[PDB]
Amino acid sequence: RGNNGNMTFNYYANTYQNSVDFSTSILNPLGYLK
Amino acid sequence: RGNNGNMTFNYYANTYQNSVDFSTSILNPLGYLK
Amino acid sequence: RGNNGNMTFNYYANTYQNSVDFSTSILNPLGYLK
Amino acid sequence: STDNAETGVIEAGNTDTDFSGELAAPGSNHTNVKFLFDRSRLLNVIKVLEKD
Amino acid sequence: STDNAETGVIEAGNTDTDFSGELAAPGSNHTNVKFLFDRSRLLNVIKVLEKDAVFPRPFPTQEGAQQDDGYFCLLTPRPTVASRPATRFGLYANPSGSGVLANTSLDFNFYSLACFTYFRSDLEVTVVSLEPDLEFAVGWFPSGSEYQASSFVYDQLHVPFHFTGRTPRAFASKGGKVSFVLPWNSVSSVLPVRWGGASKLSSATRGLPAHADWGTIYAFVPRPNEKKSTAVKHVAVYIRYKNARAWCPSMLPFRSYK
Amino acid sequence: QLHVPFHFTGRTPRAFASKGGKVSFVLPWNSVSSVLPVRWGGASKLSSATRG
Amino acid sequence: GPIPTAPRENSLMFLSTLPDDTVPAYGNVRTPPVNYLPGEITDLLQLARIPTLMAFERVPEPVPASDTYVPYVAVPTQFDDRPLISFPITLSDPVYQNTLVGAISSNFANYRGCIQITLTFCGPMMARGKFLLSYSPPNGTQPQTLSEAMQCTYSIWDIGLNSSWTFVVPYISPSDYRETRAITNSVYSADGWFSLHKLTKITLPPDCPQSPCILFFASAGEDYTLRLPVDCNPSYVF
Amino acid sequence: GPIPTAPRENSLMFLSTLPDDTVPAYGNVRTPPVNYLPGEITDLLQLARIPTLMAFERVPEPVPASDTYVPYVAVPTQFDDRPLISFPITLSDPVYQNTLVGAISSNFANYRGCIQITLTFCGPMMARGKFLLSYSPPNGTQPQTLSEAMQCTYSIWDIGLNSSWTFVVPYISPSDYRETRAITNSVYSADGWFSLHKLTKITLPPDCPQSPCILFFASAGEDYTLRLPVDCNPSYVF
Amino acid sequence: DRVTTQTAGNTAINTQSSLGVLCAYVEDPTKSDPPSSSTDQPTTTFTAIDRWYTGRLNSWTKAVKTFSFQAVPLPGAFLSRQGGLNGGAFTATLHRHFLMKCGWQVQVQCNLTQFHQGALLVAMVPETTLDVKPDGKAKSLQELNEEQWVEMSDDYRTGKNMPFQSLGTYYRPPNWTWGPNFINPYQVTVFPHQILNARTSTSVDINVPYIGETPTQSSETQNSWTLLVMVLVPLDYKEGATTDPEITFSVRPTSPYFNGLRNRYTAG
């Protein structure tokens, strides 16, 4: 999300827009007391 | 490929963009030992 | 043909682009010997 | 070969008109007259008007 | 392991060739040769024409000649002296004396990657003026052809012919920059970075491929001949390679020790 | 005769502005480590280094 | 709001070859019709394969009349063993000054393919001779006498009821395209000389005149293709 | 009316890496064909895994000939307990001056993965010896004698009918990518020294010469990947 | 194993302790096509010339240094006739055809004993000029026996020993440093090659198909595959071993392509 107005399209493909990762092959709390 | 963001369209037809050839009518290694 | 990149569209209609004619109502050689 | 040119019309002759060999591929088409002329060209210079 | 390298061909060996361990993931692909070269790179600078141009002579030239040197740029990565194809590369380190210094050029950082023998691409011409508040005009003619140089008068003003012609021109804006891509035009098949051979059949310098090149860019101002300033000026030229291919690999330039 | 430095050219990108313009571009990750630390223990080399 | 845009480095320039069109300042007009007059041109190569008379330097008898240059060959009676006409193939040589393929090649940069030359006899019908014509790719020197022009590539030719012999210089080449003029007369731009020899003497009865004549033509063959224009030579206007 | 637009801050600039193309000033041309000549390059890594002869400083006998630097090892007969060759792994060290992976690494910034080095014997067939080769990740000091190089990671090697022994330095690392040269010789850019020791003496009959020789190669393994180029070092041209 | 009887035309060579083959860039190199640039009927192969020609190269001693090489061009070797090696019928053919096009088998020759050591390096580099010091005259058969080896100076390493041109006396005389043609000896094993030494082999082969800057280069000017032999570690032998072994070579053309008849070549 962030802040964009790009609900139509982006110009470049997303692999030119920002880096993606490798291949190693309603919110949540922060640590319970068991 | 190279580096482009042109996943939508190019403006000119490709015969105006770069030269194409004539008509004479997973990668590979570089020379085996037979 | 000529030299264009306009394989998508032109802006104006063609009657505003260049003049067309009236109504009077693999190439060819240049003159045979009969 | 062995035609004579005095009839006013002669065609062209490839390599196998009289020799051994085969005809060559067409290279390009920078020849069509509605493409050849389409070039930006100045003809002259002009003194600028400033009055009647 | 326990193979011997004297057969000329050895493959690679991962960690489990002889040790315990598993092979690692492939990281990236900034390696493909039609992506690696696609970088905007200047090769040199250019003195700007302002008059009826004249171009330099063939290989020997006695004194008393009148040519205007350092105005053309025979754009290739190959080494060039005085805007005509040479075979070696100079660096005039002790330039004191008389006799004019030639315009040298070479594409420096291209060879330091180049492990090739034959090359294939298209290019683009990017120009930029270094002096401020300037407006200019770039011209071009293809390889295996030659510049037209004369002047024809219009209303007492001598105007040269390279304002017009067939081959394309380009007029910049108020301190703008001009760029366009340019395709192949060479009589030979692929560009050589090494060559045997000679230009003609006999009695020729062995090594320069005179017609396996690209072309040249010259800069000039849009003014008549008699209204020319006394201060000279400069402009640079940039090339970025495109859609490249490559064949039959070779060595690299020798690094110093020194 | 004009001394010109090398940082006009190279591999890594350049950018030439307009007449009093402004240049902007986004730039991705390039770091050898995994995530950026705002705190750190550690040292640069194995021994005899400033810790932090 | 407007669509966001980013102007690239190419601002406000105009390229001469720029393949696009511009907004008209006055439009919606008609024109007179066209169709009544025939003879269109789609390609100039339909133009280019018409015969054209070559032009040579006159043999050493300079007539003081204007432009003593000659579109034929004056065959001598005397026996000597050097050729009649020998000329190179560089399409800017002073033998290719006003041939068509020379003329519309003189403003282009590169071609590919064959080059027909043919030759039309003109003499009395009771005269008859045997003439061979020969072509050689670039040797070190120039092939001069009949053994050298014999080994290479030739055709002999009769005189009979017809009057010509269509000949086509074959197209051997290092690279597929070739140049049109030689800034440095290299192997890529020349292709060896062309010559024709008299093989047996011209034979003719009494009381009919000596020394017959032969005209030369020059035309594009089939594969002759052109490319990539260049700015022209205005030297005709001065 | 025209479509409303808003030019952003990036006006008229040109970026060197800018992934787009520009309008041609002359187009619709053809080219000579390609397919006849073989040997394409898709990636330079097909290039990068070829053997390459390393280069070392000559032992203290400087021959006054040009560039006394030696692509082999002169094993001495004498018993001493220090290694034969010890060199680090920093891909700009004066032992990695003209190896391929050093050479095409010298203009890139970061790599990942293994580095094969192999070694080819050259000596008389009646000679035979036992040589171990050993590798250690960065300790405080440098591992010098045979216990230290013994504990870490090694392989012993015979002399027989073959002549080599493919060795691969394993790839242990804090971070997955690693640098190519060390501006500050840190743990991220070095990975400990490499050495080889003689384990038992070279053994050879009479009347055959002393002191055999061994060549060194250096090649990329399988996982060796490169990234993200940098401007080059023009110091070869001066 | 290891016995390769190769028969072509009427000749037949075998090297009983050999190693194998080594093609380049395509696993079967002899395949080709007639060139597309020509128009004449090309003169293809014929069985009278499908041959191993052989020819003697210079011998080699103790006194050599590291990286010192011999290098023979091709097909320019056939012209000037080095080492008792001539094309014979083949030169009489390719004098008379302005376009020439062919690929090459090579297997080179030595045989050291079992009490020797020392590594050669047979490799054919593409597209080089390792036969001229810049005077402009290509070196010929008389000036080979005065050196027996090219002592590998720095001027080949920095590319300073390629023939330059007459600068013209209007200018300044220059200060050259670099040329694009060079030899970097720490690097020369990226070409088709195999270490030949007294370890395992005696004679060993390369094989290569065509490469070119154009579909067909000229007849008597081009030189694509110069082959060079260079020593990496020198020989050592006691008094009683066979002094100064001898080197020859064996060159085979495969699928020749001729084009364009004229008179026999006479140099201008």
Give the 3-state secondary structure of I122-178: EEEEECCCCCCCCCCCCCCHHHHCCCCCECCCHHHHCCCCCCCCCCCCCECCCCEEE
* Region of E257 on the Ramachandran plot (φ > 0 left; ψ -120 to 50 alpha; else beta): alpha
Q: Is residue E47 within 8 Å of E232, Cβ to Cβ?
A: yes
Resolution in A: 3.8
Query: Which residues in chain E (146-205) have CB-CB distances under 8 A to chain H?
Result: 167-168, 170, 176-177, 179-185, 188-190
- The gap between the terminal CA atoms of chain D, to the nearest Å, is 71
Q: Is residue E113 within 8 Å of E39, Cβ to Cβ?
A: no
Q: Which residues contact F5 (CB under 8 A, 6 or more apart)?
A: none
For testing contact with chain H, the best of E89, E106, E115 (most H CBs within 10 A): E115
As for how many domains chain E has, the answer is 1
A19: contact with F, CB 8 A cutoff: yes
Residues facing residue I4 across a β-bridge: I15
Q: What does the block give as tokens for E162?
A: 């390279």
Contacts of A23 in chain E (CB under 8 A): 25
Q: What gap in Å lies between CA I19 and CA I200, rounded to an integer?
A: 9
Contact: chain C with chain E (3+ CB pairs below 8 Å): no
I176: contact with E, CB 8 A cutoff: yes
Contacts of H136 in chain F (CB under 8 A): none
Hey, are the CB atoms on H42 and B27 less than 8 Å from each other? yes
Hey, are the CB atoms on E169 and D40 less than 8 Å from each other? yes
D28: contact with H, CB 8 A cutoff: yes
Q: Which amino acid is at E227?
A: K
E144: contact with G, CB 8 A cutoff: yes
Of I154, I209, I238, Cβ closest to residue H66: I154
Q: What gap in Å lies between CA H233 and CA B17, rounded to an integer?
A: 34
- Please report the number of interchain residue pairs, chain D to chain E, with beta-carbon separation below 8 angstroms: 16
Q: What does the block give as tokens for D12?
A: 């062209």
Residue H206: φ, ψ to 5°: -65, 175
Q: What does the block give as tokens for G39?
A: 């003879």
Nearest C-alpha of chain E: how many angstroms from D46? 9
* Region of C11 on the Ramachandran plot (φ > 0 left; ψ -120 to 50 alpha; else beta): alpha
Q: Is residue H99 within 8 Å of H52, Cβ to Cβ?
A: yes
- The gap between the terminal CA atoms of chain I, to the nearest Å, is 53
> Exposed, middle or buried by CB within 10 Å (0-12, 13-18, 19+), for H64?
exposed
Give the angle subtended at the CA of I165 by the CAs of I162 and I168, to the nearest 5°. 150
Q: What does the block give as tokens for E216?
A: 């040249």
Hey, are the CB atoms on F12 and H14 less than 8 Å from each other? no
Q: What does the block give as tokens for H136?
A: 């250690």
Give the helix/strand (H/E) hosting I206. Answer: strand I204-208
What does DSSP say about strands F15-16 and E118-129: parallel, antiparallel, or unpaired? unpaired
Q: Is residue G160 within 8 Å of E172, Cβ to Cβ?
A: no
Hey, are the CB atoms on A13 and B3 less than 8 Å from each other? no
Residue I70, SS3 per DSSP = strand
Hey, are the CB atoms on G141 and I260 less than 8 Å from each other? no
Residue C15, SS3 per DSSP = helix
Hey, are the CB atoms on B30 and H39 less than 8 Å from each other? yes
Of E59, E201, E208, Cβ closest to residue I168: E59
Q: Which residues contact E46 (CB under 8 A, 6 or more apart)?
A: E70, E71, E72, E73, E217, E218, E219, E234, E235, E236, E237
| Domain-wise residue ranges, chain G | 1-238
CA distances to G165, H15, H22, H27, I262 from G150, rounded to whole Å, are 18, 64, 56, 45, 8
CATH number, domain I1-268, options 1.10.357.10, 1.10.3720.10, 2.60.120.20, 3.40.50.1100: 2.60.120.20
Distance, CA of E202 to chain centre: 28
CA dihedral of residues E25, E28, E33, E34 (deg, nearest 10)? 130
Q: Which residues of G158-193 are buried (b: 16+ CB within 10 A; e: fewer)?
A: ebeeebbbbbbbbbbbbbbbbbbbbeeebbbbbbbb
Rounded to whole angstroms, the maximal C-alpha distance in chain D is 75
Query: Which residues in chain E (117-176) have CB-CB distances under 8 A to chain D?
Result: 154-155, 157, 159, 163-166, 168-169
Asked if residue I101 has a cis previous peptide bond (ω within 30° of 0), the answer is: no
Q: How big is chain E, counted in residues?
A: 258
H1-238 maps to CATH 3.40.640.10:
no
Q: What does the block give as tokens for B16?
A: 């105006």
Q: What does the block give as tokens for A30?
A: 């922060």
Give the helix/strand (H/E) hosting E140. Answer: strand E137-142
CA distances to H102, I88, I92 from I47, rounded to whole Å, are 48, 15, 16
Give the angle subtended at the CA of G20 by the CAs of G17 and G23, to the nearest 5°. 125
Question: Chain B residue with minimal CA distance to C4?
Answer: B12
Give the helix/strand (H/E) hosting D34. Answer: helix D33-36
| Domain-wise residue ranges, chain I | 1-268
Nearest C-alpha of chain H: how many angstroms from C31? 31
Tell me, what DSSP letter sits at residue I42? P
* Pick from I228, E256, E241, E113: nearest CA to H48: E113
- Residue range(s) defining the domain that contains residue E143: 1-258
CA dihedral of residues E204, E206, E207, E213 (deg, nearest 10)? 10
Tell me, what DSSP letter sits at residue E163? G
Hey, are the CB atoms on H30 and D35 less than 8 Å from each other? no
Neighbours of chain F (3+ CB pairs under 8 A): A, E, H
Q: Is residue I259 within 8 Å of I42, Cβ to Cβ?
A: yes
Q: Is residue I232 within 8 Å of H69, Cβ to Cβ?
A: no
Hey, are the CB atoms on E39 and F11 less than 8 Å from each other? yes
Residues facing residue G3 across a β-bridge: H5
Q: What gap in Å lies between CA E163 and CA D41, rounded to an integer?
A: 8
Q: What gap in Å lies between CA I122 and CA E75, rounded to an integer?
A: 37
Q: Which residues contact G148 (CB under 8 A, 6 or more apart)?
A: G136, I262, I263
Q: What does the block give as tokens for H70?
A: 């030696």
Question: Chain I residue with minimal CA distance to G148?
Answer: I263
Give the angle subtended at the CA of G115 by the CAs of G114 and G118, to the nearest 5°. 135
D26: contact with H, CB 8 A cutoff: no
Residue G8, SS3 per DSSP = coil
Contact: chain B with chain H (3+ CB pairs below 8 Å): yes
C7: contact with B, CB 8 A cutoff: yes
Q: What does the block give as tokens for D33?
A: 């007259």
Give the helix/strand (H/E) hosting D35. Answer: helix D33-36
I170: contact with E, CB 8 A cutoff: yes
Hey, are the CB atoms on E164 and D42 less than 8 Å from each other? yes
Q: Is residue H226 within 8 Å of H108, Cβ to Cβ?
A: yes
> Exposed, middle or buried by CB within 10 Å (0-12, 13-18, 19+), for I84?
exposed
Nearest C-alpha of chain F: how many angstroms from H197? 26
Contact: chain F with chain D (3+ CB pairs below 8 Å): no
For testing contact with chain E, the best of F7, F9, F12, F31 (most E CBs within 10 A): F9
Q: Is residue I236 within 8 Å of H209, Cβ to Cβ?
A: yes
Q: Is residue G116 within 8 Å of G168, Cβ to Cβ?
A: yes
* Pick from H173, H112, H168: nearest CA to H137: H173
Distance, CA of G126 to chain centre: 32
* Pick from G170, G173, G166: nearest CA to G194: G170
Contacts of B22 in chain D (CB under 8 A): 25, 27
Q: Is residue I105 within 8 Å of E179, Cβ to Cβ?
A: no
Q: Which residues of E215-246 are buried (b: 16+ CB within 10 A; e: fewer)?
A: bbbbbbeeebeeeeeeeebbbbbbbbbbbbbb
> Exposed, middle or buried by CB within 10 Å (0-12, 13-18, 19+), for I137?
exposed
Contact: chain C with chain I (3+ CB pairs below 8 Å): no
Q: What gap in Å lies between CA G96 and CA H225, rounded to an integer?
A: 60
CATH number at residue E87: 2.60.120.20
Q: What gap in Å lies between CA G214 and CA G138, rounded to an integer?
A: 26
Tell me, what DSSP letter sits at residue I218? B
Hey, are the CB atoms on F21 and H232 less than 8 Å from each other? no
Tell me, what DSSP letter sits at residue D38? -
Enumerate long-range contacts of G32-37, CB under 8 Å, 24 or more apart.
G32/C22, G33/C21, G33/C22, G33/C24, G34/C21, G35/C24
Residue H73, SS3 per DSSP = strand
Neighbours of chain H (3+ CB pairs under 8 A): A, B, C, D, E, F, G, I
Q: Is residue D10 within 8 Å of G167, Cβ to Cβ?
A: no
Q: Please, how many CA atoms are within 13 Å of residue G192, restricted to the half-sphere of its CB?
A: 27
Q: Is residue E148 within 8 Å of G231, Cβ to Cβ?
A: yes
Residue H80: φ, ψ to 5°: -140, 160
Tell me, what DSSP letter sits at residue F6? G
* Pick from I158, I139, I159, I165: nearest CA to I71: I139
Q: Please, how many CA atoms are within 13 Å of residue E232, restricted to the half-sphere of its CB?
A: 10
Q: What gap in Å lies between CA G86 and CA G135, rounded to an integer?
A: 10
> Exposed, middle or buried by CB within 10 Å (0-12, 13-18, 19+), for B15?
middle
Q: What does the block give as tokens for E76?
A: 């290739």
CA dihedral of residues G132, G137, G140, G142 (deg, nearest 10)? 30
Question: Chain I residue with minimal CA distance to G152?
Answer: I262
Residue I79: φ, ψ to 5°: -75, -60
Contact: chain C with chain F (3+ CB pairs below 8 Å): no
Q: What does the block give as tokens for H218?
A: 């250096």
F32: contact with E, CB 8 A cutoff: no
Q: What gap in Å lies between CA H65 and CA F17, rounded to an integer?
A: 53
Q: What gap in Å lies between CA I2 and CA I15, rounded to an integer?
A: 8
CA dihedral of residues D8, D13, D18, D22 (deg, nearest 10)? -170
Q: Is residue E202 within 8 Å of G185, Cβ to Cβ?
A: no
Question: Chain H residue with minimal CA distance to E249?
Answer: H47
Residues facing residue H117 across a β-bridge: H167
Query: What percent helix, strand, coil does chain B show, rounded to 5?
Result: 10, 5, 85
* Pick from E187, E188, E186, E169: nearest CA to E178: E169
Q: Which amino acid is at E92?
A: Y
Residue G215, SS3 per DSSP = strand
Q: What does the block give as tokens for H41?
A: 């390059």
Q: What does the block give as tokens for E192?
A: 């050589």
Contacts of E108 in chain I (CB under 8 A): none
* Pick from F9, G188, G183, I174: nearest CA to E82: I174
CB atoms within 10 A of CB G117: 21
* Pick from I58, I183, I67: nearest CA to I120: I67
Contacts of D27 in chain H (CB under 8 A): 30
Q: What gap in Å lies between CA I3 and CA I14, rounded to an integer?
A: 7
